[PDB]
Amino acid sequence: SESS
Amino acid sequence: TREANLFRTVIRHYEDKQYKRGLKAAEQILKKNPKHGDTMSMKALILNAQGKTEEAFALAKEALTIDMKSYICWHVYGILYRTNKNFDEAIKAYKFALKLEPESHQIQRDLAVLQIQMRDYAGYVQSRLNMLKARPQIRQNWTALAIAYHLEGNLEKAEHILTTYEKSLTTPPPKTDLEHSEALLYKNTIIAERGDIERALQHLETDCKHCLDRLAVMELRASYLSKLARKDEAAKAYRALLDRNPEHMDYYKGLISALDISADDEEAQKAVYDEYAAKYPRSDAAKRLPLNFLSGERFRTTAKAYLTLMFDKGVPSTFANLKHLYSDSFKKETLASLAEEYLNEYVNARPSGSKGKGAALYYLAQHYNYYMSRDLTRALEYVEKAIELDPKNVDFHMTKARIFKHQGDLAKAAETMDYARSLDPKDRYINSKAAKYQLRNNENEKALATMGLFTRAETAGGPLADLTDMQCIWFLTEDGEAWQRRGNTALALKRYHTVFSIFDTWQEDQFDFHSFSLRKGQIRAYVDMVRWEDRLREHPFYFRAALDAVNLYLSMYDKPKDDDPNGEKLAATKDPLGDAMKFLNYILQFSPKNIDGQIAGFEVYIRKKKYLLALRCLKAASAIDKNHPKVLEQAAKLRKIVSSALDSMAPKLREVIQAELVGVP
Amino acid sequence: MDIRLLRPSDIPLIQHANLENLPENYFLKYYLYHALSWPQLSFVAVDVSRPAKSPYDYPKIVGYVLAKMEEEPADGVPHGHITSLSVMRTHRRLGIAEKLMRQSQLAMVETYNAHYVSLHVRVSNKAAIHLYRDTLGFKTEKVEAKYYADGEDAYCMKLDLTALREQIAAQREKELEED
Amino acid sequence: MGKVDPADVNLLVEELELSKAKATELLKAHDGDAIKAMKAYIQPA
Ligand SMILES: *C(=O)CSCCNC(=O)CCNC(=O)[C@H](O)C(C)(C)COP(=O)(O)OP(=O)(O)OC[C@H]1O[C@@H](n2cnc3c(N)ncnc32)[C@H](O)[C@@H]1OP(=O)(O)O
């Protein structure tokens, strides 16, 4: 999963 | 002439966000020429760019009075409107600005966007035709005009615009050109939507053969062949898709139809499935699907072999993957018997591990918790035996809590779900379950602190702010219903209003993509989005919170930078039925087939003294369930009111009411 | 559960699935941007036999993979990136994430000529790490310290798609013979 | 080409809660027959  | 250059330094100071440097400048023009419209408008922008929204509008409006033929004054007026999200009033003003300054590419660009955003199709077509006339060397502008025609319902003209472009090409684009590839498929879908399946297949095979979107070509080919009753070929096509994705139900349906195999022939069907199961050992579908039409011993035998695989693997999601079969009583009882059978046959693998035994006990726990085969006492026993075997198992405790829930012990259910959470503190799913269960037990402040374990830490306004930001509708709705249950009308309404605003955002989200999709060239997706957006609020995610609001306003009617953060102004309304209308309108317009909405509408309109709309709701609800207890009650309640207030209503209303009332009580 | 290509109308329930299962969340608009930029790369798992409570029930999304092509190629070399992947806890260990990943990867190669695919995963995420390393063949490239909002490190993992590309070209040649 | 009675337009506005534009359009759709238009409008899909 990609952060922020 | 010094003012002339001074006017320019007002725009420069504006485009540099230097308000003071620009205002002080503009004020020097207005002291000498106080009725200079262009300057007043420029000042109106800066005012709006610093919250002076009401004042900016008064000023802009005054400006275009002074100079009604200035395209700047009208442009500004539009910009303000577009900023305040009134796209419709924006369109009127952009449109006139463009009639004053037809050379303005910016004005035409922004208007066109606004027009499609509000589904002004005729307007959008005119705009794109114009833009295309101005810049016809650019392919986007041809595609855009085709899209406008397409969305307008003029499929023939949209196909014409697409083909006209293709015919200008001197050289065939390379198959690497994704824009050209997407443009071919878009035209193909247009031919089929015109209903010419024969021609679309022809165009598919001839022009679209090597398009980059491989799945699209493959699915269109199978779809067309099947509709043309070209079965041998459709068979081959569905096989191609199955080999690509053995997990997609409809490809099996397609194949099986194409082979002319009757649904009665169980064994002939399984052969197809067994074939792909052999070819693709990791496909769950190729093993599981045959349990839909298999029956008797054929079912038991296949079902045992499937259950053994899953239990041996220890899979806890086995029940969830099979519960769809429980519509058939036989398959229901047989599945439980097989689990019990496996349980008895189980020996500890890995003796020198017991996951199989846990998995069967867990299956049985869920079986008897399921409403179709519910036996909460037995379910409890099975989950406890499972938890004996595996005490740190999150899913085991999760199911246990759910049994308590069904037993009605909400307290016990929240305590147990939270314990389950504490066993996997890294997993948000179980965290979300615990919070939900706590809200179900009306512990809002606790539930919010649970969610705080996963919301960004130093967010201002705490977890609630972050969850609002991230558009979390399940929690917002649950939180509202809980607050309502505690009697907190203010926070309940605030939550429901927040879900309403999330839907406004979703509707506004499509805005930048009218342009963006033309740059990507991915046109079919764009048209998919638009069509989904046209029915946005039919989603149960809107409907639930909205029906809550309407019910809570009804209750309030019978029981007399962010402003209003706790919705205290909401609760303090003098016109609740008026406040309910924006929720209700979407309900009735996008979910008319939903009786709960119709029943709620009826209650709102009789109170509003609008007996014609009341009847409309009633006739809808009754068309859905003639003998629904509420529609019968409201039918009888209406007739009394009608006989009572009929002297007061106009004769035409009186006529329509009594006439369409006799139809169905 | 059924596996199929993402639909724009699926986006609220995809977003909801992300909210339930992952600490990394996004605006709906960001889902749109994937769906409208690379409509061929994102897939969903659907509980299709879930009985409908209402005439307007949407497809019940129990899993998804959200994928993109990297707009900035490393050396002018096209490669995919997995933005987000999750399966409802109730539906894990049915092979769903594996199927979703292989569908996305195939379209990345076919449509965009992807040379590899990459992603980030929490270092403590055993379940995910075994999927990518052991089942799918991702190698680990580096550790990004405090990548995630709560400070947790991530592995940046990468899958070489050379094998898939040649495998694809081999099946392309057999069709060209038939052609 | 259908002409409409202003009292009819005001009646539909008040009793159907429609904009003057939509009320008129609905009336024009039924040849200015208000009783026909109102009956049509309250019929379900
Ligand atoms: C950013 O997006 C990259 S990392 C974000 C990962 N998502 C996430 O953490 C959300 C919560 N977890 C999940 O949603 C879910 O557990 C996944 C997506 C990580 C895995 O989903 P699946 O359950 O559907 O995976 P499967 O396809 O069924 O299994 C494939 C391989 O995965 C291994 N696996 C799966 N669950 C495991 C557990 N609990 N423990 C160890 N290993 C696990 C298996 O090796 C499986 O391969 P097999 O050969 O064994 O079948």
Numbering used by the authors:
A (entry chain I): 2 to 5
B (entry chain A): 7 to 358, 366 to 573, 638 to 742
C (entry chain B): 1 to 179
D (entry chain C): 81 to 125
Cite, word for word, the article reporting this structure:
To characterize the HypK–NatA complex at the molecular level, we determined the structure of the HypK-THB bound to NatA (Naa15-Naa10ΔC). In order to stabilize the complex, a NatA bi-substrate analogue was employed, which comprises Co-enzyme A covalently linked to the N terminus of a Ser-Glu-Ser-Ser peptide (CoA-SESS)40. Crystals of the complex belong to the P 1 21 1 space group with two heterotrimers in the asymmetric unit. Diffraction data were collected up to 2.6 Å resolution, and the structure was determined by molecular replacement with the SpNatA structure as a search model (PDB: 4KVM20) and refined to Rwork and Rfree values of 16.1% and 22.0%, respectively. The electron density map was of high quality, showing well-defined density for the CoA-SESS bi-substrate and HypK-THB. The active site harbours the CoA-SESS bi-substrate analogue, which binds between strands β4 and β5, perpendicular to their plane for CoA-SASEA in SpNatA20. During structure building and refinement, extra density appeared in close proximity to Naa15 TPR-C that could be unambiguously assigned to HypK-THB. HypK-THB contacts the TPR-C and helix α38 of Naa15 through an extended interface with a buried surface area of 786 Å2. The interaction involves hydrogen bonds and salt bridges between HypK (α3, α5, the loop connecting HypK α3 and α4) and Naa15 (α36, α38 and the loop connecting α35 and α36). The contact involves an extended hydrophobic interface between HypK-α3 and α5 (α3: Ala87, Val89, Leu91, Leu92; α5: Ala114, Ile115, Met118, Ile122) and helices α36 and α38 of Naa15 (α36: Leu689, Leu690, Leu692, Leu695; α38: Met726, Ala727, Leu730, Val733, Ile734, Ala736).
